[PDB]
Design a protein around this ligand. Structure first.
Ligand SMILES: *[C@@H]1O[C@H](CO)[C@@H](O[C@@H]2O[C@H](CO)[C@@H](O)[C@H](O)[C@H]2NC(C)=O)[C@H](O)[C@H]1NC(C)=O
Ligand SMILES: *[C@@H]1O[C@H](CO)[C@@H](O)[C@H](O)[C@H]1NC(C)=O
Ligand SMILES: *[C@@H]1O[C@H](CO)[C@@H](O)[C@H](O)[C@H]1NC(C)=O
Ligand SMILES: *[C@@H]1O[C@H](CO)[C@@H](O)[C@H](O)[C@H]1NC(C)=O
Ligand SMILES: *[C@@H]1O[C@H](CO)[C@@H](O)[C@H](O)[C@H]1NC(C)=O
Lengths: 316, 267, 362, 318
């Protein structure tokens, strides 16, 4: 059907228009040299774990070392010359944060000096930690839900409680490439059938479609013209077929050598680069919420552990 | 290319209800620990909201022989929450800059326009013929020929009333109009760097002295004097952010005074 | 290095296992040897007769002494005018290798300017002396006034208009330390990127200086692609003074900080960036080239081999060969803590020594 | 001399190279149409500057201050009401409430009426979000970057006499140039202070500006834009874009009586009228774009210290 039904049945000479390249199409007609790097890709839409164990890994140790040192200093000051023998821990770790913790009127001069030095250290550490969080927001990565064609999500949508969805155009070469890779993927795509390219675009904009599979550079063009950069691909063609486009001439066409040399002339002089500059939009570049979820949940798990420790200290 | 900071009212019911119910449960279980001692309820509430206050309060220390650990964990908890909240609100209001421009004629969204990017020119303008001559301006010519305007003031009123969305015009005039009307902001790129003179007759001997008088105006600072006449003479806010904040604060003050009337009537 | 000498050694990597996969697919045997020179082979003049000739891999292939150049060759127009080429399996462009990522002290107290810090200290000292004089001219009291001043200054250890002006100064000092926090935030916003302009159309690159040391491989297809380009005489005359035999020569040269730029294929320098982080590539993907297999003329082992490569395209053969080594790769709280910890520990030791002195007096 | 002596004395036809335009050349020969917007400009040293952290007027803008006073008065009045329900914190409640803005107030004995505790909690949450907005404004101040220039324009007081300011400086031009003729036709004193400060070569003057042998220089605009587009380090960006300058063009001086003139003018307007001149300008003009940054915050330190001394004098005399 289509251009293969026109050229092979000799109602057309060649396919100067764009065409995917695979086994049996190369068996029936002869393609030209590849003139553009067009593999396949997956388009998806828009949208940290903790901040104590990876970030405060070894600074935590030295802060506890200096905390025990300053606590021993305060115990020695109180025992040299009204309750700061074992209760210096709550006072000292309240002055770590300076939470305006009501403890005592500091009569020890050495105690006031150590509290002043530690409070200046706490102010500069708070400034450094705010700068750390600022640089953490500047280093803004955008992780994806699926970073693999062999995904466990790509085996059964019961892996997570919302099942996602992705399809292609019917009777396409991409469907044949999937059926030449995984028939079970075609079985899952059978429930996810849709007709139009821009119909799938409307489904992605309105939220009636999760992901989509098409070629690489055409979706790069669609993401360049995307309204508000709402649609970003998964990578730039990493776990994909990495194919190309040619001009399918008949098997035995004398024009094949001249057209191949003409395309090799058109690529290696900046003319093809000028046409790519003219005909590819690329405004949506890379590396461009207010509620995190995982961080305060992990602090809630540590808080539940603190409930358990409080129960242990309460029963004994 | 043209509000409330999303503190509690634009944001949904996560943070305020979460912190409120959390400090409620913490205060209840610490007062129940005060019951199992190894206006005391009001003192426990004052201590809990003073730890959540984190700005200074004239309070003491209750019987916290084993409540001090949960109190210090809750105190560091509250301060790391408000520190992360300050940090990400500031970093949210720093990097809140989307793409709100065109960047010149080399825009493929304007090479294939739509019903949103409304750009046109003056009816019977020389720039229209200048683009009609060129080799790739055909689609933009077909887009601009649909809505040609009589005067430039029509274009200014249309782009002011969001009828237009872009307009090709001379740069310094648009800078003067941006000085006059600050709502009209142009793009950054510059094209068609041309010279503008006087529409004249054919070869005339008085025309030569006219051109020499123009050159005499060029050599002295009279061009800068004409710039002084027209060209040179140009022309965390907390008034929308923290104004409704103070409105809800004043309403909470009136409601709290009413609750104090209820408390004095109870006691 | 050597005039002429030949040893049998071991070859492996990408195209070797590709040829093993082809021998598994198509029924043939091999005769694997290396190219004689270290050049791709350009159309250079022979020593007489005003005639240009190809050499290198083409010189070994056209003489009948080679059957198949299994190598990701830069398929250009000129070499395809003579002999037939296979389908390009690899889509790979060009990139520039530079020496970036050269950084710490973070300006806390000792790398921070202590002139204005001593100004703040002397200012709060004069304020404390003036408030004690207002205590004397009332409308351990000196020690209590100094301890109150230095405690409210650091917002910790705190026990009529004099206290009002002191709290004005305290809020003023909190404005000062908020500006200090903003300065330390601005210290770590951004690095210094793009020490070398990566634009190929940069007029700074069109007219280089003595410091701009950029080279290329001697007699490569990249040199032929530059020879076609009608405005690249300057970079040609620059790189002909630094013609490098192998790419490992350029790796050693930029490794010893002798080079500054090098036009090369993308994924090779990406793997070398995985090797060494200071070896930094660029992001401008120009001359998106196709790499195939160097082939003979019309041959019975041409179309079958092209269809075998096409059959190899559909599965994850190039995918898991990228998973072998191409995918295989090889500020924080820790930067701003070390000198701070050492300076605070030394200050604590010196303060404890001063406390020994004060207890020896009191 | 030069190309004028070649063309006017009929040894040359026209100067295809770049030529300055004045009245006497238009009298002796005939120029073509201009094609490029090339005025004059002044290159200065323009050393390292800051982003001027002067002050802040974004949250309050001298209008929220009455709201501060009214809310302090309401807090003090309800504190007096709780004291009426309940011994020295009548006006001192305002002092404690503004001390709790900066979370270090001395805790005066709080009553059991609890209304003061409620309004302290409300004002304390307001002070938390106020300090958060203050740090957010400090972070948003980092976004822009601009260092001020020592010269406002062609009517500079430094262009009058550097003895008016405390450092004196120097400035040169190209010798025997038409820029010197434009100076002598506009500012004779500029020529007087320029004559002793001459130089030899344009790149030599650039080396003199880099190494410190010269402070200022006067030249054409777009050629110095090209020199900034090839500048090593890129530490020189000129003031303005020809707004306070001559803003002339470049043309081709043909002999008086040449039939080539209309054809050359049509060819130049064809070269501009198709974007090919834009292609040539893209090919031949292409460029790019501390611990003591508080040099204006210390001015605020000076003003607040002076205000503190004045208020101490006012509270001391009575
Ligand atoms: C254009 O103006 C100039 C200047 O007035 C005239 O040219 C010269 O004028 C002076 C004074 O009248 C004469 O002495 C010269 O002989 C003139 N030289 C030339 C160029 O002929 C010129 O007459 C004016 N032309 C007109 C009539 O527009
Ligand atoms: C030759 O290849 C074919 C492929 O089907 C198969 O018969 C077998 O692998 C090979 N036979 C020989 C000659 O070993
Ligand atoms: C041939 O050999 C001579 C030996 O000196 C050398 O100078 C000449 O350049 C060579 N010609 C070429 C380009 O083959
Ligand atoms: C592969 O090899 C066979 C035998 O040489 C040849 O007849 C055939 O045309 C080639 N390709 C196909 C289509 O199998
Ligand atoms: C400038 O003109 C004078 C005229 O006498 C000449 O002596 C001098 O060499 C010239 N200087 C330069 C370098 O232009």
């Amino acid at each position: 059907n289509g251009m293969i039904g026109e050229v092979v049945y000799q109602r057309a000479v060649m396919a100067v228009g764009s065409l995917t390249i695979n086994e049996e199409r190369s068996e029936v007609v002869d393609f030209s040299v590849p003139f553009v790097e067009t593999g396949i890709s997956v388009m998806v839409s828009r949208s940290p774990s903790a901040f104590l164990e990876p970030f405060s890994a070894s600074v935590w140790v030295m802060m506890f070392v200096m905390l025990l040192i300053v606590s021993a200093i305060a115990v020695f000051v109180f025992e040299y010359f009204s309750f700061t023998i074992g209760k210096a821990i709550w006072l000292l770790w309240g002055l770590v944060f300076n939470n305006s913790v009501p403890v005592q009127n500091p009569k020890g001069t050495t105690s006031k000096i150590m509290v002043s030095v530690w409070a200046f250290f706490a102010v500069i550490f708070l400034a450094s930690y705010t700068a750390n969080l600022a640089a953490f927001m500047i280093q803004e990565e955008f992780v994806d839900q699926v970073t693999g064609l062999s995904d466990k999500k790509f085996q059964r949508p019961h892996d997570y409680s919302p099942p996602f969805r992705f399809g292609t155009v019917p009777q396409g070469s991409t469907e044949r490439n999937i059926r030449n890779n995984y028939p079970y993927m075609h079985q899952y795509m059978t429930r996810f059938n849709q007709r139009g390219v821009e119909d799938a675009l409307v489904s992605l904009k309105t939220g009636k479609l999760d992901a989509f599979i098409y070629d690489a550079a055409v979706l790069n063009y669609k993401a360049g013209r995307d309204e508000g950069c709402k649609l970003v691909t998964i990578g730039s063609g990493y776990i994909f077929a990495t194919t190309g486009y040619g001009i399918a001439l008949q098997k035995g066409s004398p024009w094949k050598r001249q057209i191949d040399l003409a395309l090799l002339q058109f690529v290696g002089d900046g003319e093809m680069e000028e046409l790519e500059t003219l005909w590819l939009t690329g405004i949506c570049h890379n590396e461009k919420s207010q509620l995190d979820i995982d961080n305060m949940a992990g602090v809630f798990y540590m808080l539940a552990a603190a409930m358990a420790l409080s129960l242990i200290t309460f029963i004994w | 290319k043209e509000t409330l900071d999303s503190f509690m009212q634009p944001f949904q019911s996560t943070l305020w209800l979460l912190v409120g119910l959390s400090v409620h449960v913490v205060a209840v279980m610490l007062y129940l620990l005060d019951r199992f001692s190894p206006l005391t309820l009001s003192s426990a509430m004052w201590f809990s909201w003073g730890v959540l206050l984190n700005s200074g309060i004239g309070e003491g220390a209750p019987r916290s022989f084993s409540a001090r650990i949960l109190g210090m964990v809750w105190a560091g908890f509250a301060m790391i929450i408000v520190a992360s909240y300050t940090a990400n609100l500031a970093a949210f209001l720093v990097l809140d800059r989307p793409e709100e421009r065109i960047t010149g004629i080399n825009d493929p969204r304007l090479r294939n326009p739509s019903d949103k990017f409304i750009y046109a020119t003056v009816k019977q303008s020389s720039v229209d013929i200048y683009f009609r001559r060129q080799v790739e301006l055909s689609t933009m010519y077909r887009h601009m020929e649909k809505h040609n305007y009589e005067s430039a003031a029509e274009a200014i009123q249309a782009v002011r009333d969001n009828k237009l969305h872009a307009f090709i015009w001379d740069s310094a005039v648009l800078e003067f109009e941006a000085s006059q009307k600050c709502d009209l902001v142009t793009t950054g790129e510059l094209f068609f760097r041309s010279g503008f003179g006087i529409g004249m007759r054919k070869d005339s001997p008085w025309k030569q002295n006219v051109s020499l008088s123009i050159l005499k105006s060029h050599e002295n600072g009279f061009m800068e004097d004409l710039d002084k006449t027209w060209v040179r003479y140009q022309e965390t806010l907390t008034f929308e952010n923290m104004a409704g904040v103070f409105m809800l604060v004043a309403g909470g003050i009136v409601a709290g005074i009413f609750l104090i009337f209820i408390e004095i009537a109870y006691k | 290095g050597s005039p002429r000498h030949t040893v049998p050694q071991c070859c492996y990597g990408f195209c070797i296992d590709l040829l093993i996969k082809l021998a598994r697919t198509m029924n043939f045997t091999y005769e694997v040897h290396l190219v004689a020179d270290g050049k791709f082979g350009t159309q250079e003049r022979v020593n007489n007769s005003n005639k240009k000739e190809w050499n290198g891999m083409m010189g070994e292939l056209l003489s009948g002494q080679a059957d198949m150049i299994v190598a990701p060759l830069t398929i250009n127009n000129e070499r395809a005018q003579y002999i037939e080429f296979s389908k390009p399996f690899k889509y790979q462009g060009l990139t520039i290798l530079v020496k970036k990522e050269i950084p710490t002290l973070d300006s806390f107290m000792q790398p921070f300017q202590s002139t204005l810090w001593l100004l703040v200290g002397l200012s709060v000292h004069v304020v404390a002396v003036m408030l004690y004089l207002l205590d004397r001219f009332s409308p351990l009291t000196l020690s209590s006034a100094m301890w109150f001043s230095w405690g409210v200054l650091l917002n910790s250890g705190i026990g009529f208009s004099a206290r009002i002006l002191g709290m004005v100064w305290a809020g003023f000092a909190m404005i000062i330390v908020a500006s200090y926090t903003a300065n330390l935030a601005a210290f770590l916003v951004l690095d210094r990127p793009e020490e070398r302009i990566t634009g190929i159309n940069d007029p700074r690159l069109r007219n280089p200086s003595d410091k701009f040391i950029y080279a290329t491989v001697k007699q490569s297809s990249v040199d032929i692609y530059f020879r076609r380009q009608v405005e690249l005489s300057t970079m040609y005359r620059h790189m002909e003074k630094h013609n490098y035999e192998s790419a490992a020569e350029a790796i050693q040269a930029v490794r010893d900080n002798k080079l500054h730029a090098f036009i090369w294929d993308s994924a090779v320098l990406e793997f070398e960036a995985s090797q060494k982080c200071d070896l930094v590539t660029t992001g401008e993907l120009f001359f998106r080239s196709g790499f195939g297999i160097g082939m003979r003329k019309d041959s019975p082992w041409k179309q079958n081999v092209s269809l075998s490569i096409l059959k190899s395209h559909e599965n994850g053969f190039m995918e898991d060969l990228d998973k072998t080594w191409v995918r295989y790769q090889e500020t924080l709280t820790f930067e701003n803590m070390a000198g701070v910890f050492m300076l605070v520990a030394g200050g604590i030791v010196a303060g404890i020594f001063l406390i020994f002195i004060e207890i020896a007096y009191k | 001399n030069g190309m004028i002596g070649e063309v006017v004395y009929q040894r040359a036809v026209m100067a295809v190279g770049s030529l300055t335009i004045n009245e006497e050349r238009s009298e002796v020969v005939d120029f073509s149409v201009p094609f490029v917007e090339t005025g004059i400009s002044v290159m200065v040293s323009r050393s390292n500057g800051t982003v001027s952290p002067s002050a802040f007027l974004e949250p309050f803008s001298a209008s929220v201050w009455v709201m501060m006073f009214v809310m302090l008065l309401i807090v003090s009045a309800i504190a007096v009401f709780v004291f009426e329900y309940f011994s020295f914190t009548i006006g001192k409640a305002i002092w404690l409430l503004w001390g709790l803005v900066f979370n270090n107030s001395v805790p005066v004995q709080n009553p059991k009426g609890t209304t003061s505790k409620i309004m302290v909690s409300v004002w304390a949450f307001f002070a938390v979000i106020f300090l958060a907005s203050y740090t957010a404004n400090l972070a948003a101040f980092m976004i822009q970057e601009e260092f001020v220039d020592q010269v406002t324009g062609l009517s500079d007081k430094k262009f009058q006499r550097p003895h008016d300011y405390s450092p004196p400086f120097r400035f040169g031009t190209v010798p025997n140039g038409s820029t010197e003729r434009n100076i002598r036709n506009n500012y004779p004193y500029m020529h007087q202070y320029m004559t002793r400060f001459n130089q030899r070569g344009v790149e030599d003057a650039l080396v003199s500006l880099k190494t410190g042998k010269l402070d200022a220089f006067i030249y054409d605009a777009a050629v110095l834009n090209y020199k900034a587009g090839r500048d090593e380090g890129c530490k020189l960006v000129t003031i303005g874009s020809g707004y306070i300058f001559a803003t002339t063009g470049y043309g081709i001086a043909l002999q008086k009586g040449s039939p080539w003139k209309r054809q050359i003018d049509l060819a130049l307007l064809q070269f501009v009228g198709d974007g090919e001149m834009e292609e040539l300008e893209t090919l031949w003009l292409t460029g790019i774009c501390s611990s003591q940054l508080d040099i204006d915050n210390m001015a605020g330190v000076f003003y607040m210290l002076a205000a503190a001394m004045a208020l101490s004098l006012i509270t001391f005399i009575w």
